[PDB]
UniProtKB/Swiss-Prot annotation, chain A:
<comment type="similarity">
    <text>Belongs to the transient receptor (TC 1.A.4) family.</text>
</comment>
<feature type="repeat" description="ANK 13">
    <location>
        <begin position="35"/>
        <end position="64"/>
    </location>
</feature>
<feature type="repeat" description="ANK 12">
    <location>
        <begin position="1"/>
        <end position="28"/>
    </location>
</feature>
<feature type="repeat" description="ANK 14">
    <location>
        <begin position="67"/>
        <end position="96"/>
    </location>
</feature>
<protein>
    <recommendedName>
        <fullName>Transient receptor potential cation channel subfamily A member 1</fullName>
    </recommendedName>
</protein>
<comment type="subunit">
    <text>Homotetramer. Interacts with TMEM100. Interacts with EGLN1. Interacts with the scorpion wasabi receptor toxin at the same site that electrophiles but in a non-covalent manner.</text>
</comment>
<comment type="function">
    <text>Ligand-activated Ca(2+)-permeable, nonselective cation channel involved in pain detection and possibly also in cold perception, oxygen concentration perception, cough, itch, and inner ear function. Has a relatively high Ca(2+) selectivity, with a preference for divalent over monovalent cations (Ca(2+) &gt; Ba(2+) &gt; Mg(2+) &gt; NH4(+) &gt; Li(+) &gt; K(+)), the influx of cation into the cytoplasm leads to membrane depolarization. Has a central role in the pain response to endogenous inflammatory mediators, such as bradykinin and to a diverse array of irritants.</text>
</comment>
Amino acid sequence: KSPLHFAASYGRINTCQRLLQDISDTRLLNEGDLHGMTPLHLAAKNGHDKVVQLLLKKGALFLSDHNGWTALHHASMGGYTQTMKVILDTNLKCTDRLDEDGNTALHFAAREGH
Amino acid sequence: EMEILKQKYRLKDLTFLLEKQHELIKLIIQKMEIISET
Amino acid sequence: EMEILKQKYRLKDLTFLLEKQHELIKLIIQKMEIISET
C-alpha cells in the first residue's frame, strides 16, 4: 500500500508497474492516505504525467480525497499542464467538479498564478 | 530606474535557473536506488 | 542608492552560489546507481 503511495508521489514509474501487476484486485489503486489521497491524487499533485497515465489506464476511477479535491484540483495547484491534459483528455466530468469549499479546478489554477 | 531593471533581469534568470534545477532534483528522486530506507 | 547596490551584490553572490550548486546536481545525476528505475 504505502510503497505505492511513495512510488506514485515521486514519479517512480517502474516501481509502480511492478506493484500494479495484481490488477485483478483493485483495492490498492483506489486506496486512501491519511488525508484520503489516492495514488492518482499523489501522482497529479507533484505533476507526473506518466504515473497519472498508467494509473488511469488501469482504472483509478477519479475518486475524491478529504477536503473534496480531485486529481484535477491537485494538478491545477502546481500548474503542471502535462498531467492536466492527461486528466482532461480522459473524461470531461472532472473539470466541472467542486471541493467542499466550492472551488473548482479553475480556482486553484488562478490563485497560485499559473 | 536602470538599477532596478538590471536587478529584475538578474532575478528573472534566477527563477529560470532554479526551475531548471528543480526538474533535476525531481529526476534524481525519480531514478534512484532505494533499498535500505524503502 | 546604497541600498539597491548592496542588494545587487547580495544577488550577484546568489547567482554564483546557485550556479556552483547546479553543477553538483548535474554531477549527482551523472555518477549514480540506477538499477530499479532504469
